[PDB]
């Protein structure tokens, strides 16, 4: 279930990074076809995952970036 | 390659001559810390109004003049532009801007936006996912700052940890962003830490070794730590 | 000053892989004759579709690739871009494009469009005036070609008259455009003529003298002729 | 009346320029507030004025252009 995952991730993030100054995380692929319910659930999953963290940056690349 | 973020900021908040919005200033500060005085960042603000009206064009120039001033204050080199759009045309206006930005010049490769300000009520969010889709279909990375009201300005010197969480596929992009932030004086006193989240199949030892070598390939100084997902 | 037109073309016709639209090619030919191999012209096409759809983005790239080829064939130096917009968002998409074009580069100062193709039925025209308003509120001249299906391509050598009609205020802009066209081989065999239309108060003799001196100030070779409006 | 003017202008244009290769004319200021009737009449005035002319370019500057 998606909530199980978001909640477990929140547990880990708080266990290891509750006092960190900044957390960077992958931004999951957004939903398709602009279903109004699928949007509210996308946002909710991310809010649960990052509950009580003060500074978070989500990043999603094109996958084509070559850093080296 | 040596890919570095060439930023496009999209601002969609209300503008007033009586207040300055701190979330907006803090997003400029975050951009400036990523760029360390380099590059050319494009900052665009979307202003609801009549796009054929002289009064609204005058308003858009005032907002552009404020953005130029604020970008200079935070030492963010680049350009500001204010787009006027009708209320019912915000979607096409935002999408067309991401399509049309960089014509005949360097094109941005990274969009920087803030997490939506208000709680879900049953718009602000409907704009948000539109921006996410616009970045990816225009071959841009996207960077979303959540908690931007609490992000530091140039007067602060942060110390403690910057944590990057790494999962099964991803890429080195999160890690690069942390590294660039640590180059700025605001974050220079922070330690960079990469936390790998292990699946039930991966063994923790070999995931630590892989990330250690990868970080070394990137020439980034970071401590590696492996955490197990399941419980 | 030495103002010369830095062109932005806006195309809003349907695209098909089975046909090439001659009105579109002739508008590129007219732009190329105005620029005589110089400058950087921006040519934008608006394509109805889903601006988050990969298929429609692929279509937009094919149309951009055709525009690049056609601009090269007519020796029009510059850039092509295809904007995808939802049907109900065409107004914001077109207005935002005129606002956002030239960011960090030279901005166009002249919009070139064609007269609407079909007769008034009771859209194509509602787009047209939107484009006219967008030019002026973004400080652009606008040039509207009417009869573009009959305009000449590079294989023709026109001879005869190019007539500029001058009225009480106006400016030297019409005259400049005629002069630039006469610099291209397509129109080089044409004589340039300025026809002043006199009001009931103006005397024909002194209007002829004024236009003769003005044309001489512009360093443009043109014959002056005065016609009376009333009858 | 606007039609009187458009028709008289068409008469002049045809009298002096019916056989010209190209005619350049000022584009009048477009109507305001997007009144659907004021649009149809703007277009009609210009179509009457340029009836039977094969090649016409309308131009409207900002008024700020300095050609010299």
């Amino acid at each position: 279930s998606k909530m199980h995952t978001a909640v477990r991730l929140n547990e880990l993030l708080l266990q290891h990074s509750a006092n960190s100054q900044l957390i960077l995380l992958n931004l999951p692929k957004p939903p398709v076809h602009k279903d109004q319910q699928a949007l509210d659930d996308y946002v909710h999953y991310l809010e649960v995952m990052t509950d009580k963290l003060n500074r978070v940056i989500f990043v999603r690349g094109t996958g084509k970036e070559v850093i080296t | 390659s040596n890919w570095r973020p060439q930023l496009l900021l999209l601002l969609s908040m209300q503008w007033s001559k009586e207040i300055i919005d701190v979330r907006y200033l803090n997003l400029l500060n975050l951009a400036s810390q990523l760029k360390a005085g380099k590059g050319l960042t494009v900052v665009t603000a979307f202003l609801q109004g009549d796009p054929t009206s002289p009064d609204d064009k005058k308003k858009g120039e005032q907002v552009k003049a404020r953005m130029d001033f604020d970008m200079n204050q935070v030492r963010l080199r680049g350009f500001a532009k204010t787009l006027v759009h009708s209320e019912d045309q915000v979607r096409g206006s935002m999408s067309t801007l991401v399509q049309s930005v960089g014509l005949g010049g360097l094109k941005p490769n990274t969009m920087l936006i803030s997490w939506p300000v208000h709680e879900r009520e049953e718009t602000e969010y409907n704009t948000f996912i539109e921006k996410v889709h616009a970045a990816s279909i225009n071959d841009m990375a996207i960077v979303v700052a959540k908690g931007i009201i609490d992000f530091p300005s140039a007067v602060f010197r942060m110390s403690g940890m910057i944590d990057v969480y790494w999962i099964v596929h991803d890429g080195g992009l999160c890690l690069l962003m942390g590294y660039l932030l640590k180059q700025h004086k605001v974050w220079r006193g922070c330690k960079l830490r990469v936390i790998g989240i292990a699946q039930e199949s991966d063994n923790n030892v070999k995931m630590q070794e892989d990330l250690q070598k990868y970080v070394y390939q990137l020439r980034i100084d970071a401590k590696i730590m492996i955490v197990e997902l399941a419980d």
Side-chain angles (χ1 to χ4, degrees), chain A, chain B:
Chain A
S1 170
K2 284 178 190 299
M3 266 297 291
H4 282 81
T5 300
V7 167
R8 176 55 184 148
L9 287 182
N10 182 241
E11 291 188 4
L12 286 187
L13 295 186
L14 286 186
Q15 183 181 5
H16 297 282
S17 306
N19 297 324
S20 295
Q21 298 304 338
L22 183 63
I23 294 175
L24 295 95
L25 301 167
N26 180 68
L27 182 74
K29 177 68 189 169
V32 175
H33 281 10
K34 207 198 304 177
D35 188 76
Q36 185 49 55
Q37 186 61 32
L39 158 66
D40 303 324
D41 300 326
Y42 178 78
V43 171
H44 184 54
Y45 170 93
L46 301 177
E47 282 173 339
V48 169
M49 179 185 68
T50 56
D51 189 58
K52 304 207 244 176
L53 296 181
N54 291 327
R55 306 189 189 95
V56 170
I57 296 175
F58 293 107
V59 183
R60 178 175 199 80
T62 66
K64 316 186 184 189
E65 300 89 358
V66 184
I67 306 307
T68 54
Chain B
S1 64
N2 291 25
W3 184 110
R4 254 131 183 96
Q6 312 295 342
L7 292 174
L8 166 66
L9 278 59
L10 301 184
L11 315 165
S12 38
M13 79 278 181
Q14 290 289 334
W15 290 82
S16 152
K17 68 173 179 158
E18 324 180 36
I19 60 165
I20 301 159
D21 179 86
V22 175
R23 289 180 180 92
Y24 143 78
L25 289 180
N26 286 359
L27 195 74
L28 298 190
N29 279 295
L30 176 62
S32 182
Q33 294 158 6
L34 288 172
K35 300 299 307 162
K38 293 299 180 170
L40 296 178
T41 295
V42 181
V43 180
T44 63
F46 291 87
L47 174 66
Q48 184 163 314
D50 181 358
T52 75
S53 151
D55 290 323
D56 282 323
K57 169 191 177 56
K58 178 70 61 176
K59 293 194 177 66
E61 292 168 356
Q62 285 165 336
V63 170
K64 180 195 181 299
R66 286 181 55 173
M67 277 186 291
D68 289 334
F69 170 92
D70 294 324
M71 289 174 65
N72 181 73
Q73 292 291 126
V74 309
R75 286 212 171 275
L76 181 56
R77 257 63 176 86
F79 300 93
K81 194 64 174 69
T82 294
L83 294 322
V84 177
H85 63 84
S86 306
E87 182 176 359
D88 57 317
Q89 298 290 294
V90 67
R91 273 178 204 260
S93 172
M94 286 186 175
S95 158
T96 291
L97 180 280
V98 185
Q99 292 178 68
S100 61
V101 55
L103 256 159
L106 298 184
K107 209 147 292 177
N109 64 20
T110 303
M111 184 186 290
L112 173 63
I113 63 175
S114 181
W115 190 262
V117 166
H118 314 278
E119 305 180 18
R120 318 195 286 308
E121 310 168 35
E122 293 177 350
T123 57
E124 275 94 321
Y125 291 84
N126 270 305
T127 302
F128 168 71
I129 285 316
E130 273 286 293
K131 291 189 202 168
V132 173
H133 284 132
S136 68
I137 196 67
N138 289 291
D139 282 296
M140 297 183 187
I142 189 159
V143 176
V144 183
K146 177 171 191 295
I148 191 73
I149 194 60
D150 288 324
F151 276 53
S153 60
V155 295
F156 292 96
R157 301 292 185 265
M158 311 302 283
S159 51
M161 307 301 308
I162 295 167
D163 294 337
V164 179
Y165 280 84
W166 197 101
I167 294 169
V168 175
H169 303 95
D170 301 8
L173 211 57
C174 274
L175 178 52
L176 180 63
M177 304 287 293
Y179 167 89
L180 299 176
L181 286 180
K182 184 185 193 301
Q183 305 309 299
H184 195 270
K185 65 184 182 169
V186 162
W187 304 96
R188 188 175 294 258
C190 285
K191 300 304 157 60
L192 190 62
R193 177 164 71 164
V194 182
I195 299 162
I197 304 159
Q199 305 292 343
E200 309 175 14
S201 60
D202 312 356
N203 74 103
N204 300 11
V205 177
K206 293 166 218 177
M207 196 183 186
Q208 154 97 31
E209 304 176 18
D210 291 329
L211 279 176
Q212 173 85 1
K213 308 275 187 168
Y214 185 73
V215 153
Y216 176 83
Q217 294 171 347
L218 309 183
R219 296 304 190 269
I220 302 174
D221 176 66
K223 173 175 193 168
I224 312 290
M225 187 185 189
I226 303 298
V227 172
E228 194 132 38
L229 185 61
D231 193 357

